[PDB]
């Protein structure tokens, strides 16, 4: 039988079969419940929608995300989402397929206890595994060395690897990702009057960000240019025809990644975090880590991120080092692709947590056979 | 047992069984009593005449409408009208048929509380249920969603719906309707010397309104044409052979709907009262409401109201929208058609307020089950 | 030279000299224009009215507010109001008096830009300044650490301040204030048959809300008691001598502040707003914020509001964190008293935007020299 691969992204769930080059079913990780008094019988049924059928009817819905900063926060909702991904998107029976979930580094352990318990007692998958997304991303690049800078909707994290041996002490994590950038955009937009207040309008500001934002190579130069000319402004059309116009908001939002003092945080930017992660690693290996700066996750899709990161890290690291930021075109799906590759491997068969293992050991077993 | 459907409009009573596509009994809502002395015996009796009879003797009667601005004020007269409807018109005892009574939004709760009291304690129906009119209007059109404009004899209200879910905070009620247009037409005919005063002559200026009134496309240019030549004049034959002629009084009267400042009121004309109702909805669904604008009720029957409405809204809403005024050909009875459809459903049986529930709950029960 | 402190409210304008502990002039911020036709010669002149002379005549006027949600919607009218305050009320030649004005947080930049432009060019004041309203609201209390809850007629907004250092990420601004409660009260009044629809009647409903509305502590049980008997009902004599009797509408109105769903808004109540604001401030200062909540603005003068908000915040914070709400009885004018104090301080004399500085810098200086 062929195992599945279900990447529980913070924002979007990725799913697909083991061996597929690309995921087969992608849909935002939302649960919607209406917030108005229904009037028509035979109509407005299905108290709760999931994924696509909650986006396409969000006008009257309260969209709750069940995954917050990479940590599942509302279990009965994630159960519905898994049930959907299994029985409606892929159209598969879970009991007859192994599966490969994922997790971010340094998440509370009870999180993965509960993931495993749901998978084994509710859906009765024969065997399942829980990887760490950065390792999978480094698989996907077809590589053996690097410092995966992964960042998606919830979290931004680094994971240095050298010739197959992880360096757990050098891992750095940071809760500043796509959702926080969106929430800061909602706020900088009110300088022009555009008030977005509802959970549904978060999904409009998200796409405004996705389509219009970019990261300036140099922030102060871009601020000056925007202030002294209109060459940057770009106009966007709401769902209801209103045409909004944004200028320096196109780069003031992505720039949050590098100066988290914009959104009130104290910690340092992603470039400084990566440098401080490399400098935790033994002297003999930093030379290769500087030369394999892999990237992953959606939030690294902004134009100008790769060049900005290369410039900044070159500013940090010594003059003699050969920095290289690697940005695969499919980096949004790198984690899932690597997961498929790992699941298809010939030597991975023994590594599963068999149903018998859970029977004889409980959910705590998942800490001995996982990274 | 078959279920009855009644629609106690402010202008006419529409009543008849479910499953039919047209009301069985249609007649005006007036009870007339003599204002003169009856000298002859046997003939000249029955101090109260109702419905069509009252009109046929409107010479020697004072005609009272028990309903004014959708509110039932004279309860004795209204009970008379219902007694006529049940026994003389439909010929079927109310003691053995569930009933559905239409009603208007933002009405005093005492209104429907007393409707329930009267139906259960005076006529002893097995079960009754009260429904809004815009909801049923939408039912008739076979739609899932759309902004309904309903404008009968007394009350004009908008109820934007979405996928079977309404928006109570987006309702508007504008108590300016056919009766007020009749009064203003009566007031502006005197510019020619046709002094209509009596109520019986209100029943005739209303006939003039129903026959000749039409809504122009541009008021200023129509006035220009009217001043230019006699092309717009048309004549009408009173009951005693006199022939009248009216020019710009034909469209100056429906103009009220678009400029209630004509009759002193301040609230904005139906174009603005519909635009402002859409512009209070979730920003997501406005594009949907624009393209599914429904109409209903008699007052929307003026030749050309749909085009003026479309013009005004398209001049208000963003240029990218694709407006559509859904005007059913039978829109006069649309409320009752929708009521028949709703009463005929198999899964609507969960909504009837049974005699048992009223007896052990009191009239206040009607609010727990009625929108 | 004496300075002027002009707190432009959305419903009232509190303006006067700095140093006093009360404004020298208060008048509603409405510009009325006659709407009927004048017939008597020697009358009908002065075809645009302002303030209280636009109350006592409101019978024959359409009342329009310049500010809708702390935003200056109209400028041709706000110029009239400012001219009125400077010349007719205070009788002061503005060309020789520094003026200090106010604004809310997250308020569009063009708003204060154009305020500066008008004051420096239309009136030609030697110097001026604009201050957020939570800063002044906290000055008036004499503290230096606390999270203000300003609740005006148009806007409700918190500001966490610690030792004089604001927390710009934790400023929660909610556009739901006294005016929206006025409109909700008008909407629910009809349930009893009372129908107020026009601008003038909106003032009557404002006074009804002021006099009779109050906040309950347990809304569900308050409704239970109100339904049980008429113990809570009180009467009000409209200006023509009519008498209305409002019952549960007394506290169903200001309950909206703690359940913004009633009017369709999604955000959580103001207690939840304040608590969510607090839990985003670094952990060590939450203790000092939980004990220094300062109320302000007119809409906070509901009876029982302080008890309700204290109870509800206790329901959200942990058990051992002291929770207090400081509510000065004079709080309606807290913003203006803070403005007076700030203008009086000896060290503030350098913080003005001088006419010279504007002349050589342009409006953008407003965002530079002012917070
Ligand atoms: N082309 C893009 N440009 C900028 N941001 C993007 C782009 N595509 C996705 N994002 C952002 O990245 C996040 C989704 O990336 P993804 O890696 O799928 O997150 P997750 O793995 O948590 O589901 C979203 O917050 C989205 O706003
Ligand atoms: N063909 C028509 N043209 C213009 N006005 C009409 C026409 N028919 C009815 N009306 C007006 O609409 C009112 C009756 O229509 P209706 O929709 O049935 O109101 P209701 O249902 O409350 O009784 C009358 O007052 C009349 O003035
Ligand atoms: N006792 C009261 N109860 C409730 N609301 C009140 C009371 N007094 C005044 N208000 C409301 O406060 C508002 C005006 O007060 P104010 O603080 O000055 O608002 P603004 O900042 O715009 O000037 C009005 O909307 C009024 O309805
Ligand atoms: Mg990911
Ligand atoms: Mg009608
Ligand atoms: Mg204020």
PDB file of C-alpha atoms in Angstrom, chain A residues 237-242, chain B residues 143 145-148 160-162 271-272 274-294 309-310 312-326:
ATOM      1  CA  UNK A 237      -9.930  46.207  -6.540  1.00  0.00           C
ATOM      2  CA  UNK A 238     -11.934  44.936  -3.581  1.00  0.00           C
ATOM      3  CA  UNK A 239     -14.592  42.245  -4.012  1.00  0.00           C
ATOM      4  CA  UNK A 240     -17.194  45.026  -4.213  1.00  0.00           C
ATOM      5  CA  UNK A 241     -15.491  47.197  -6.824  1.00  0.00           C
ATOM      6  CA  UNK A 242     -13.775  49.750  -4.590  1.00  0.00           C
TER       7      UNK A 242
ATOM      8  CA  UNK B 143     -33.564  32.274  -5.403  1.00  0.00           C
ATOM      9  CA  UNK B 145     -29.912  35.098  -2.277  1.00  0.00           C
ATOM     10  CA  UNK B 146     -30.726  38.671  -3.225  1.00  0.00           C
ATOM     11  CA  UNK B 147     -31.822  42.020  -1.858  1.00  0.00           C
ATOM     12  CA  UNK B 148     -35.617  42.260  -1.813  1.00  0.00           C
ATOM     13  CA  UNK B 160     -31.092  41.634   2.188  1.00  0.00           C
ATOM     14  CA  UNK B 161     -30.707  37.852   2.383  1.00  0.00           C
ATOM     15  CA  UNK B 162     -27.740  35.567   1.680  1.00  0.00           C
ATOM     16  CA  UNK B 271     -32.811  54.073  -4.812  1.00  0.00           C
ATOM     17  CA  UNK B 272     -30.757  55.457  -1.922  1.00  0.00           C
ATOM     18  CA  UNK B 274     -31.632  50.256  -1.260  1.00  0.00           C
ATOM     19  CA  UNK B 275     -28.071  51.316  -1.991  1.00  0.00           C
ATOM     20  CA  UNK B 276     -27.501  52.226   1.660  1.00  0.00           C
ATOM     21  CA  UNK B 277     -28.921  48.862   2.698  1.00  0.00           C
ATOM     22  CA  UNK B 278     -26.500  46.977   0.451  1.00  0.00           C
ATOM     23  CA  UNK B 279     -23.642  49.224   1.606  1.00  0.00           C
ATOM     24  CA  UNK B 280     -24.194  47.967   5.173  1.00  0.00           C
ATOM     25  CA  UNK B 281     -23.588  44.311   4.309  1.00  0.00           C
ATOM     26  CA  UNK B 282     -20.401  42.310   4.698  1.00  0.00           C
ATOM     27  CA  UNK B 283     -18.004  43.643   2.075  1.00  0.00           C
ATOM     28  CA  UNK B 284     -17.891  40.162   0.544  1.00  0.00           C
ATOM     29  CA  UNK B 285     -21.524  39.791  -0.505  1.00  0.00           C
ATOM     30  CA  UNK B 286     -22.218  43.248  -1.957  1.00  0.00           C
ATOM     31  CA  UNK B 287     -21.189  42.089  -5.429  1.00  0.00           C
ATOM     32  CA  UNK B 288     -23.765  39.323  -5.063  1.00  0.00           C
ATOM     33  CA  UNK B 289     -26.579  41.549  -3.813  1.00  0.00           C
ATOM     34  CA  UNK B 290     -26.063  44.049  -6.631  1.00  0.00           C
ATOM     35  CA  UNK B 291     -26.753  41.360  -9.224  1.00  0.00           C
ATOM     36  CA  UNK B 292     -29.818  39.817  -7.542  1.00  0.00           C
ATOM     37  CA  UNK B 293     -31.990  42.839  -6.748  1.00  0.00           C
ATOM     38  CA  UNK B 294     -35.549  41.564  -6.405  1.00  0.00           C
ATOM     39  CA  UNK B 309     -34.187  51.949 -10.178  1.00  0.00           C
ATOM     40  CA  UNK B 310     -31.408  50.388 -12.246  1.00  0.00           C
ATOM     41  CA  UNK B 312     -30.133  55.324 -10.046  1.00  0.00           C
ATOM     42  CA  UNK B 313     -28.304  52.423  -8.410  1.00  0.00           C
ATOM     43  CA  UNK B 314     -25.823  52.130 -11.282  1.00  0.00           C
ATOM     44  CA  UNK B 315     -25.198  55.848 -10.811  1.00  0.00           C
ATOM     45  CA  UNK B 316     -24.572  55.152  -7.109  1.00  0.00           C
ATOM     46  CA  UNK B 317     -22.709  51.841  -6.965  1.00  0.00           C
ATOM     47  CA  UNK B 318     -19.138  51.288  -8.203  1.00  0.00           C
ATOM     48  CA  UNK B 319     -18.766  51.332 -11.972  1.00  0.00           C
ATOM     49  CA  UNK B 320     -17.623  47.689 -12.103  1.00  0.00           C
ATOM     50  CA  UNK B 321     -20.879  46.185 -10.788  1.00  0.00           C
ATOM     51  CA  UNK B 322     -23.402  44.402 -12.998  1.00  0.00           C
ATOM     52  CA  UNK B 323     -26.811  45.506 -11.728  1.00  0.00           C
ATOM     53  CA  UNK B 324     -30.052  43.591 -12.305  1.00  0.00           C
ATOM     54  CA  UNK B 325     -33.557  44.463 -11.092  1.00  0.00           C
ATOM     55  CA  UNK B 326     -35.317  41.092 -10.888  1.00  0.00           C
TER      56      UNK B 326
END
